Structures are given as C-alpha cells and as structure tokens.
Amino acid sequence: MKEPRYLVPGDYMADPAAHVFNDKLYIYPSHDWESGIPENDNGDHFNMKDYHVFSMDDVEQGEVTDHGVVLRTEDIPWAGRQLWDSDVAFRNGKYYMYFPLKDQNDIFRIGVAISDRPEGPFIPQENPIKGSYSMDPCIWPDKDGEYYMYFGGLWGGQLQRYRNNKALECALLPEGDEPALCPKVVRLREDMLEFAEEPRDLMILDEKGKLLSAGDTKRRFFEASWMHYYNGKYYFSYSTGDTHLICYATGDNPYGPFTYRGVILTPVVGWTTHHSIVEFKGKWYLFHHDCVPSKGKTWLRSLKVAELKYNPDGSIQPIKGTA
Amino acid sequence: MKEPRYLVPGDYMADPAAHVFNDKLYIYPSHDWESGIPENDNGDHFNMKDYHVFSMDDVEQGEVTDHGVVLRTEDIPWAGRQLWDSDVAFRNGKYYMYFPLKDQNDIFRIGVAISDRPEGPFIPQENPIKGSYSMDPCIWPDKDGEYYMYFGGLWGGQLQRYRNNKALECALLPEGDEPALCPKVVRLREDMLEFAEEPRDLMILDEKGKLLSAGDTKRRFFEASWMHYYNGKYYFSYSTGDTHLICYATGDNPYGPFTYRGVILTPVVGWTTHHSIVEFKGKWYLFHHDCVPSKGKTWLRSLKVAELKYNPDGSIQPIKGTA
Ligand SMILES: [Ca+2]
Ligand SMILES: [Ca+2]
Secondary structure (H helix, E strand, O other): OOOOEEOOOOOEEEOOOEEEEOOEEEEOOEEEOOOOOOOOOOOOOOOOOEEEEEEEOOOOOOOEEEEEEEEEHHHOOOOOEEEOOOEEEEEOOEEEEEEEEEOOOOOEEEEEEEEOOOOOOOEEOOOOOOOOOOOOOEEEEOOOOOEEEEEOOOHHHOHHHEEOOEEOOEOOOOOOOOEOOOOEEEEEOOOOOOEOOOOEEOOEEOOOOOEOEOOOOOOOOOEEEEEEEEOOEEEEEEEOHHHOOEEEEEEOOOOOOEEEEEEEEOOOOOOOOOOEEEEEOOEEEEEEEEOOOOOOOOOOOEEEEEEEOEOOOOOEOOEOOOO | OOOOEEOOOOOOEEOOOEEEEOOEEEEOOEEOOOOOOOOOOOOOOOOOOEEEEEEEOOOOOOOOEEEEEEEEHHHOOOOOEEEOOOEEEEEOOEEEEEEEEEOOOOOEEEEEEEEOOOOOOOEEOOOOOOOOOOOOOOEEEOOOOOEEEEEOOOHHHOHHHEEOOEEOOEOOOOOOOOEOOOOEEEEEOOOOOOEOOOOEEOOEEOOOOOEOEOOOOOOOOOEEEEEEEEOOEEEEEEEOHHHOOEEEEEEOOOOOOEEEEEEEEOOOOOOOOOOEEEEEOOEEEEEEEEOOOOOOOOOOOEEEEEEEOEOOOOOEOOEOOOO
16 A cells, blocks of 8 residues: 555544454454543543444455444443553453453553454453553563553553552652653463553663653653564554654563664644554554544544555654644 | 450450341451551551451450451452451341452452351452442441441542542642531442442531531541431441541431531540440440550550440430540
8 A cells, every 4th residue: 555545434433453363454443433522631532432343354455344333331340431442362262352441430440351253242341450550451462472461641541640550649740851651561361351460661761771751752652552573573662642653662572671763653633643563464554543534633533554664674664644 | 334345455456347246246347467567657557457356245244256367368359458447237148348458559449248147257259349449438227228338538548539439630638618528428239249329428517507627627527437326316427537536427317418416535545546336235335446555556456345325415425535
C-alpha cells in the first residue's frame, strides 16, 4: 500500500490491536461512539462501552469482516464504566482478552475475558486482576515461553496515582528535570488470570542511558504500550500524548531498559494517537487511527493501516501522520 | 461489675465486635502484635495479620475461650496487608465475616469470609466486594429482615479519597465550617457476597438538624461505626479519632439522619478507641480497649468491658475513660 487504507468506514473504531491467528489478521479496537458528554480533562468523553472484532485475509486489498460485538460493559460483573484500549493473547488453546475498565469506585482496573476462538464471544471473569491498575495493556508472547503485560497511561489513565504499584494519598505528576514515569511490565502466570509477580518500571532511557525526564514530552512515555520483535531485537513503541507522537525504543529483553530511537508516526488528525505493529504476509503494518472522517472530533476515531518499513541498521522509517 | 474487666490479658487484642450467637457471647477483635515496624503517620505500625475468636457464657467473671486463629492474611487470595477492624453477621444458616484489607495496590477493600459456626475458621472469598472501600465495617440485621453495612474511616481509613463512592485524583479532608465526611451505609444482598445497591451517606446532624462540621472534632465521625437498636430508638455509635471520644446518635431507621446525643466514653489510655455494644442476659455492656497492660503503647491494645446503662429518656450514661 502506497497510501494508508481505512478499514472500517461505517463505524468509529480506535486503538487498534492487530494479531495473526490461523493465518488471518484479527484486529481488536475500541469502539468510539458519540456520548452526550462534552469534552473534559478526565476523559469522560471517551465513554466507550463495547468491543468489536475485525478480521482480514489481505491487508492491502482484502475485504474486512465485522464479527460484531464480543463484549460490553453490561456483561461485566465488576463493571463501572469506560472500556478502553484492550489486547488479546493466545495461550493454552484459548484466547485471553485483557481490557481496562474503571471499577465501581472509578478506579481503572484490568479484567480478563476468555474465548475458544479469536473472533468468538468473550466471557469475562467476575473480578478484575488482583493488583491491576491503570490502563492500555499490551500482552507480549515472548520467546522465553512466558507472556508479559505492558500497561500504563498518564493523566486519565491514573498512572500518576501510583508509586511502585501502590496508590498515593494524592496523585503526583513529575515535572521538568525529574525522571518521568515509566510504563509498567509484569509477567503473567500460566492460567493467564493473574499476575505471576509484582509489576515494575520498564525504564526508557536516553542515548546516554539516562531515564527520560518529565519535561521531555516529545519522548516521555504517555500511553499506548506495544512490544514486537524484529531481526533479533525488541521494539517498545508508545504514544507521547500531548506531542501526538508514536515513538519507539529498543532492548534485548522484555524487562531490561529500552533506549529511545526515534519517531514512527508524526501527529495525526485528532488529539490521540494509538497503534499496533504486526507482520502479515512478509510485510509489516502500522495499524492506527485519525479523526478525518469525523472531521477533527477527538473522541470519534477511525482506524487505518499503513505499511511499515525498516532500515538495514534496524531503525524504522518514519511515517507521516495526517496532520 | 464494679470495675472494668479485661478479657484477654495473655495477648494483645483490639476493636472488639461482640455478638450473641446460640445464647453465647462471641467477640471478633483485631490481633495486635509487635511487627518490628516503627510508628508513623500512615499507620503501618497497625500491622495486624490474623483474626482470633473469643467466646464467653458470662461476661463479668466467666471463662474466656480462645478459639484460635480463624483467618490470616496468607489465606486471602487477594491479600495485600493489614487486617483491620472486622465484624460478623449471621444469615442463611451461615456466618459471614466482613474484613477490611488493603489490596495489592494498598487500597483498602472489604472482603467476605464464610464459616458454618460462629467460632470456626472463616474461609475467605477470592476477591473483595465490588465497589467496596475504606474500612471498619459493621453489619446490622434490621427488623425489616434486611442487612446493612456501616463502613468508613478517616485518614488511615482512606475515606477522604472518595466522594460518592468514586475515587478522587487527590484526597480531600474538609475543614472548619465545611460539613464533615459522613460514614457510609449500604444494604447487602441476599447471598451477602456483594452490595445490593450504591452506598449512601449516613448523615450525623446536631440538635439544629444541621450537618456536623469538620472543625467539630469532638463530635464528627472518624471511625469505628456501630449500630444497635434499643427501645424504639436506633443508636449509631462511633469514634472521634484525635479527640479520643466515642459518641452516639439517635435515629428511627437504618438509612435516615442521626442526631448527635452525647459521649459514651471519655478518652482511654492510648490514641485509638473502638467498641461494640450488645445486650447479654439482661445487661448491656460496652466492649472496648486501652493500652494499660502495654504501658501506653498505642498499637498494642488489650480488650476490656464495662456495663452500660440508660436513662429513662433514652440517653446513655457516660462511662469514664482511663485517660
Ligand atoms: Ca494498544
Ligand atoms: Ca467494628
């Protein structure tokens, strides 16, 4: 594809998460809809309430299939509000969907929904994962045989309310030269229902190996954690929020510190930018979204796909955002 | 009794929750112990980890039976730390123990533990109650056949972190003429596993029908909620924290407004004061605690009991504290 292709024109789907199951490419995006709520700093206008599942056979010219709703807030027993960016992993012959959702105390937790097939209806557990907090989870099937979750999100994601997995009496956002908050990493146990250990900082560093500062808002982690593997190297990509960038870093292990490299996606139409990187049929793709069909409305996002290409030195060729 | 009696002089127990099951008197206190943790503002020195159960047939001079440990943190699947003031309720031929415990995020939640007998080991549920927060729960079997929970606790109890059951970005403690934070009340459902509704405030008014102010620390709610019914009137008693008082209020229904009456017990030796009021064999008793055996060590408390009498107008005779 020479030009970015919009996949679902009929509805507003955001925060795409693409995976390859049974030689098919499945997408697990959020579902944006027009709630009657005006914009807000706490992100109340992001009032998604369900999940659809899309699948393709050919990303570039292929037909896109809507499998319909597979999960909604009503079906979740511990549900409060706001189903945000989710992710799916395949293990033990089953598919585990990890969704963020404020509990009945308006605290962001992460729940698990299970299905026997990647597109089939997901049945949620009655309670959120023990110790879970914040949002935007990413589930990475590492080569060591284990499955790792990467989560975290500034501001509306309540990540600043916590220090070392423990909630603060009062939220605290680091400023200026102070080290910025890191995204979190935690290993999941085999049944994929709970954490196997305590989550820890996924350190993102300079080229000098120094932790990114809070003022460095063009490189500092904000949200949208994602992890993939190419040419014997790890790639941790993410969103920078108020600078509207999708950056990426590199490392040699799922835990070890990741060193910032560059920018994958320049600012797009809309305040938010969210993504997922996956290889399909020999080519890499950067699934993401912008607010072009909604004519600039941030809370109404349409998912799209652009071809991602690497340089021989391992770096990623920057992709132009719409804006 | 012509002088208050200690019940477990061999160990350190606090926050007594006295009930009458099978013509016996059962107490469900917290188990203080020297954890090696020094005193600090967040109350880490209150590091209780297990529950004992005590029973008597005669309060004044009868033998107190130590039924041993019936629940410990290590058995709770969602365990974090600090098992604080709990209470038990009898329904459906079973005994439900409602215990407060910080989750793996140091957020105070309330969980349910079930036993077939008032002293037998309570098997805890895998997850805390949905929407639960703060601590010091008190279950009340009303005459309507329903069951209500009265929870809430300031400062260490994390009540100020919440407004209308929703977590604040930053904790807020009201001051001066502002209306003080009210304790909470919620009707449990039939299986006693979850809430049947949204928790509401239990308003405590003055003699002018006006909400108690935060500056009025000698009367406003702090912790240690307790509800009992005597001669057509309800009696909501509680602790006042830094004024070391236990006061009580009167109402006509479990939800309705309660009007402040007076002080049940003046400051005792130690900072904390906690209690439970129950009638046993024609006599009313005020179960509580102080730190006389521990020579003033606030977090090493010892249970004690004193007879409580009423005036013909319905008021409660003030009991003199050790301090
Ligand atoms: Ca994502
Ligand atoms: Ca109590």
